[PDB]
From Swiss-Prot, chain A:
Cross-link (Glycyl lysine isopeptide (Lys-Gly) (interchain with G-Cter in ubiquitin)): 25, 31
PTM comment, free text: Monoubiquitinated at Lys-25 and Lys-31 by RNF25 in response to ribosome collisions (ribosome stalling): ubiquitination promotes subsequent activation of RNF14, leading to EEF1A1 ubiquitination and degradation and rescue of stalled ribosomes. Deubiquitination at Lys-31 by USP16 is required for maturation of the 40S ribosomal complex.
Location(s) in or outside the cell: Cytoplasm; Nucleus, Nucleolus
Superkingdom of this protein's organism: Eukaryota
Free-text function comment from the UniProt entry: Component of the 40S subunit of the ribosome. Part of the small subunit (SSU) processome, first precursor of the small eukaryotic ribosomal subunit. During the assembly of the SSU processome in the nucleolus, many ribosome biogenesis factors, an RNA chaperone and ribosomal proteins associate with the nascent pre-rRNA and work in concert to generate RNA folding, modifications, rearrangements and cleavage as well as targeted degradation of pre-ribosomal RNA by the RNA exosome.
Species the sequence originates in: Oryctolagus cuniculus (Rabbit)
Residues annotated with N6-acetyllysine modification: 22, 31
Subunit structure: Part of the 40S ribosomal subunit. Part of the small subunit (SSU) processome, composed of more than 70 proteins and the RNA chaperone small nucleolar RNA (snoRNA) U3.
Part of the intact protein present: 83 to 150 of 156
Name listed for the protein in its UniProt record: Small ribosomal subunit protein eS31
Zinc finger (C4-type): 39-62
Region (Disordered), start-end ranges: 1-13
Curated annotation (Swiss-Prot), chain B:
Disulfide-bonded cysteines: none
Lineage: Eukaryota, Metazoa, Chordata, Craniata, Vertebrata
The species this protein was found in: Oryctolagus cuniculus (Rabbit)
Secretion signal span: none
Protein name as annotated: Small ribosomal subunit protein eS12
InterPro entries attached to this UniProt entry: Ribosomal_eL30-like_sf (IPR029064), Ribosomal_eL8/eL30/eS12/Gad45 (IPR004038), Ribosomal_eS12 (IPR000530), Ribosomal_eS12_CS (IPR047860)
């Protein structure tokens, strides 16, 4: 049943409520001015959102990390 | 209007042409695919009312007003566990957009006649 080495947990995804509010920035106007950019590759759709990082910009399902 | 909307959502669930979910609604809005939607206004939403009205009145999307959001999850049938009874282990939904394929129905014609006028 139990073992000696401690079991490392599998990365269960966290619980975030109303997440879309930090993706589409809410300005004064009713325009969806989103700071998250758009992936120029046509293999992935425009809906499929990318990754937001600090020294790079990983794309969607294209597996192309558009670094600086 | 009630039987028409229930039958339209029923046949949309039959054909599975609806992209349910706020995320897939954002996919359809960014991909410019929006005909009609279901919305519940004046709820206990702390910030979401302005956001959903901003994403609704931006790209000619239909408007409908429902009282609260926790009963919105019964039209599309989210938590229909034990269908032989009133569902009880249910959470609600914010909005459901439907890309309708079976658009021709019994009274959706006069619903869109109201919508266009
Ligand atoms: Zn891409």
């Amino acid at each position: 049943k139990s073992y000696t080495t401690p079991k490392k947990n599998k990365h269960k995804r966290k619980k975030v409520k109303l997440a879309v509010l930090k993706y589409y920035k809410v300005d004064e106007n009713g325009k969806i001015s989103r700071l998250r950019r758009e992936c120029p590759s046509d293999e992935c759709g425009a809906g499929v959102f990318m990754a937001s990082h600090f020294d790079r910009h990983y794309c969607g399902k294209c597996c192309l990390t558009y670094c600086f | 209007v009630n039987t028409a909307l229930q039958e339209v959502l029923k046949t949309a669930l039959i054909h599975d042409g609806l992209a349910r979910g706020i995320r897939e609604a954002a996919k359809a809005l960014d991909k410019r695919q929006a005909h009609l939607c279901v919305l519940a206004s004046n709820c206990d939403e702390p910030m979401y009312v302005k956001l959903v009205e901003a994403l609704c009145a931006e790209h000619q999307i239909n408007l409908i007003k429902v009282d609260d959001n926790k009963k919105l999850g019964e039209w599309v049938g989210l938590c229909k566990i034990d269908r032989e009874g009133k569902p009880r282990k249910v959470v609600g939904c914010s909005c459901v957009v439907v890309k309708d394929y079976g658009k021709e129905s019994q009274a959706k014609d006069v619903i869109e006649e109201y919508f266009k006028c």
